[PDB]
Amino acid sequence: STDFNDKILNEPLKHSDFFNVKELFSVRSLFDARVHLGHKAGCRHRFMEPYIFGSRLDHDIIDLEQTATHLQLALNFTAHMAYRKGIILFISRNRQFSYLIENMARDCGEYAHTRYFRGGMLTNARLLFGPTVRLPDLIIFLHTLNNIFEPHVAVRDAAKMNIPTVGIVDTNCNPCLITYPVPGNDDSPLAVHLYCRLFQTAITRAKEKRQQVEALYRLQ
């Protein structure tokens, strides 16, 4: 058990990019997906200024260099969690992409909550689901805002319950409590599809690498 854990769990933590997530994307791919388009300058959020490249005719432009760095970190974290077999829950209240996100979750073997987030799903989880339920080990927000342009209550609840949160934060979002913010465009279908594909690929790579490493260790 000791050696197994030491060589399985802690081995990947010794490498900058163990799962090679940087190859999954490039600044050009994000640009082509339009990850760099934000809302009007009037909708801008005070905490999203550091990630905004500028304002092109009252339209904010998200610094895709910072997006690339943040996306690297978020994808690496997600890959490591999937490798460690944690529960990854995808949250998004964008009804335009509810179906897509649910399908991505089902395909990648993780969970999704794209519906009306009932109060207490995380803070009252033991009562709602059962005393032995296992809460998600990572929450990935494809849209950190609810359908009234307020932060998803899941963000606050995840911070409360100490569940790390990856999250795509647009120029009108509040990245303060999101553990791994990925400044980007969460409203374009192209951008949302790119995010879904990236997270799906990273999680699948992590799971398959976990299986491969386990087989390598157990066969010897």
Added chain:
Amino acid sequence: AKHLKFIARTVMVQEGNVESAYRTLNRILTMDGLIEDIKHRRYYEKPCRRRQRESYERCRRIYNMEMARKINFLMRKNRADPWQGC
């Protein structure tokens, strides 16, 4: 008194529909504020009450114009739910 008669506030009836003529005249007086002015001048509105009423009407107009702007802005979003079910 010293002006010519039948030029001010005079409307000509078309085809004999005095009801339409009176409606047009009433619209004219109301838009010019004469009806409200007469109603308010029936009794003396003391200056403080007049100022309070003017301020209240200005605030009411600001609020109504802003609410109408919001309604007209959001009216487009009264479409059929495109993502019904999901």
